[PDB]
Structure formats: structure tokens, C-alpha cells
């Protein structure tokens, strides 16, 4: 039973201030990296900040550097996320997640927190679709610091809940995922293949990497894949 949860999303005013929490149980907090990840309504997802098991490696994403501070209790088992000069694009779900050290996947999410304040770096196809039992690829283009330079991680994210390990280390499928589901990767670009699509699968799918240039994680804008069926279409000869 690993959990995470957020808690203290609400509605603040621009230039106003918050303080995420989220909480641990389950494993061995202290011996993990933590991240905090966003989703603003209706958009992709957005890496903001980590921190390694003893805080002594910080990173942040350039649009919240100098205004966010991320910061951990390893005795209360908890992760916590500082917001100031808030601005309406931080108008988002924030999700907590933890970093497995030997890939840098991000194997347990969170459920999320709200927070209404009151352009991907990798690219995706928008949307993706297909009849059942078809095969359907979907595309991840980067450049040479990202996907050229790091191994790339795939996340689905079923409509109504937190995102979900899908793919890791370009190929590798994390127990719970089957072989329907494969990930590959060459030169600046990296595909998730899934053969067999059943309805269960309409989804959205991002791609992640980290960034040698950027010093941060980078998604894609995410891929909402649409598993159709039949189609009554009238031809005409």
C-alpha cells in the first residue's frame, strides 16, 4: 500500500501565496528523489520542481524558478511546495510523484491538488485514433540534450485520474503493463506502440525526458487517444 497525497489547493489571488503538502506512506520516503508535476485544466503535463532523499540536489523549471521552493520533512515522511507571486498560468492540478533512482521514472503519482490562480518542449501528436484491435504509434520528437542525451519515460493517463508509469528506460514496461504496450527510441525521437487497442486504452499518453540543457524535465503536450468503433459511412461510387 504506497500512497501519496497533496493537500492545500484552493483559490488564491495573483501575487498571493500557498503551500502544497504531500504525504508519504508506505515506503521508505527518505531514500527517494520527489518531484512535483502540474496539469493545467484541459493541458498537458508540466514538470515544476525535485528534490533528491537528503534535499541536496534542487532543481526547478525555469518559469517558476526564483518564486517556488521545494523543500521536504524526511521525519513527518512529507513533500512540500512553496508558491509565490502566483500568476494565472499556475492555475493547475499539482501532483506529487516519486523518482526510482536507477531510470528517473516516475513510478507512483499522487491524486492531485487544485490550485486556481483568480509550448511543449517535447512534441506530440494532439490526438490519435483507431478501431479496436488495430495498432497505433504515437510519436515523441526532442531534440539532442532531451531524447538525444536520456533514456525517455511514458505515462497514461486514464480520463478521471492521476497519471501512471507506462514505459521506462525507452522499452521497459514496469510490472502491471502488458506487452501490448512497447516503447522505442532512436536518435531524437522515441514512439509507444500499442498493438491490440481495446477501449479501455482511450487515454492520454505523454512522453517525458530529462533535459541536459534545461537542467529539467521535459513532457510533451500529450497524445488523447480515441479507440472508435464501425463508422456507418455512406459511399458513394
Known amino acids: 500500500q504506497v500512497t501519496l497525497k497533496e493537500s492545500g489547493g484552493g483559490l488564491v489571488k495573483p501575487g498571493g501565496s500557498l503551500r502544497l503538502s504531500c504525504a508519504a506512506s508506505?515506503?521508505?520516503?527518505?531514500?527517494?528523489?520527489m518531484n512535483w508535476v502540474r496539469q493545467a485544466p484541459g493541458k498537458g503535463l508540466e514538470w515544476v520542481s525535485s528534490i533528491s532523499s537528503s534535499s541536496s540536489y534542487i532543481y526547478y523549471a525555469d518559469s517558476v524558478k526564483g518564486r517556488f521552493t521545494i523543500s521536504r520533512d524526511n521525519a513527518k515522511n512529507s513533500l512540500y511546495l512553496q508558491m509565490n507571486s502566483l500568476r494565472a498560468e499556475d492555475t493547475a492540478v499539482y501532483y506529487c510523484?516519486?523518482?526510482?533512482?536507477?531510470?528517473?521514472?516516475?513510478?507512483?503519482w499522487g491524486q492531485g491538488t487544485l490550485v486556481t490562480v483568480s509550448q511543449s518542449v517535447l512534441t506530440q501528436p494532439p490526438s490519435a485514433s483507431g478501431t479496436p484491435g488495430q495498432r497505433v504509434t504515437i510519436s515523441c520528437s526532442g531534440s539532442?540534450?532531451?531524447?538525444?542525451?536520456?533514456?525517455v519515460n511514458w505515462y497514461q493517463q486514464l480520463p478521471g485520474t492521476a497519471p501512471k508509469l507506462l514505459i521506462y528506460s525507452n522499452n521497459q514496461r514496469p510490472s502491471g503493463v502488458p506487452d501490448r504496450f512497447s516503447g522505442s527510441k532512436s536518435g531524437t525521437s522515441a514512439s509507444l506502440a500499442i498493438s491490440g487497442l481495446q477501449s479501455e486504452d482511450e487515454a492520454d499518453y505523454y512522453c517525458a525526458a530529462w533535459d541536459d540543457s534545461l537542467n529539467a524535465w521535459v513532457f510533451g503536450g500529450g497524445t488523447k487517444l480515441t479507440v472508435l468503433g464501425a463508422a456507418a459511412e455512406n459511399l458513394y461510387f
Open positions: 539532442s540534450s532531451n531524447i538525444g542525451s536520456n533514456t
Open positions: 508506505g515506503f521508505t520516503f527518505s531514500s527517494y528523489s
Open positions: 510523484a516519486r523518482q526510482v533512482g536507477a531510470t528517473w521514472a516516475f513510478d507512483i
